[PDB]
Design a binder for this molecule. Structure first.
Ligand code: FRU
Ligand code: FRU
Lengths: 130, 130
């Protein structure tokens, strides 16, 4: 129901939606609580966003960071946007990576989990935005 | 004339100032064109910023990124905010690192340069915001 590049994201893994942005959980989060915040409009580069979308994207990112930091017990946050092919972008849609951090944390297999586990995680996250 | 944690930044190295933010060049940029965008108000964590400051911080960051990417000839940009002690924050002031990226780029000595070279670089950057 949500667009993220050329794949549709099921609303079950989406925990926040604003007039212009949405936040979703990852299939293979690099650290517990690694989430993404993206503009609803699928643009490829950061410069394509309107001032409206830029503000909303980052106000949402601030709200999400506070929540994931709280829920996954981090003491800091790393926010990062890989803007472009040479930056590391894989999917052509601007998005911010929000990763809760903690001391000593360091930063289809791996961190992989089921869709249901993602939906469970997203449901726990929706509680903080009620 | 500008505050960045507990040190004053000379206006000569500052290339953009808005009602709520400013952008400055680095002493030891990690890649050519690595600049910083920070809120004028010296806050320690991202969550301390008001919605006002959040929007402004990131609208400015979008403008700066477009410029540094143009000037230093990058084809992408990496934006990053180390929010907190466990994230890597060194100076207690929220700020975004804007780093122009290009193919094969990889990502008091080193990249070190004089204050005058920093002032020269900032002056070249001010031209794009005229
Ligand atoms: O995923 C983070 C969540 O998992 C726990 O460690 C297990 O319930 C919680 O205290 C926290 O809220
Ligand atoms: O620092 C980037 C600048 O330096 C040059 O390589 C040397 O003048 C330019 O073309 C560019 O504008």
């Amino acid at each position: 129901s949500f667009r993220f590049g050329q794949h549709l994201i099921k609303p079950s893994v989406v925990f926040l939606k604003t007039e212009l942005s949405f936040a979703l959980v990852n299939r293979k989060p690099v650290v517990p609580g690694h989430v993404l915040v993206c503009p609803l409009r699928p643009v490829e580069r950061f410069h394509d966003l309107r001032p409206d979308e830029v503000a909303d994207l980052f106000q949402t990112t601030q709200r999400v960071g506070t929540v994931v930091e709280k829920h996954f017990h981090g003491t800091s946050l790393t926010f990062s946007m890989q803007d472009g092919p040479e930056a590391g972008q894989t999917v052509k849609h601007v998005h911010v990576h929000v990763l809760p951090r903690k001391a000593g944390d360091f930063h289809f297999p791996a961190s992989w989990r089921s869709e249901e586990e993602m939906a469970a995680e997203a449901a726990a996250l929706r509680v903080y935005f009620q």
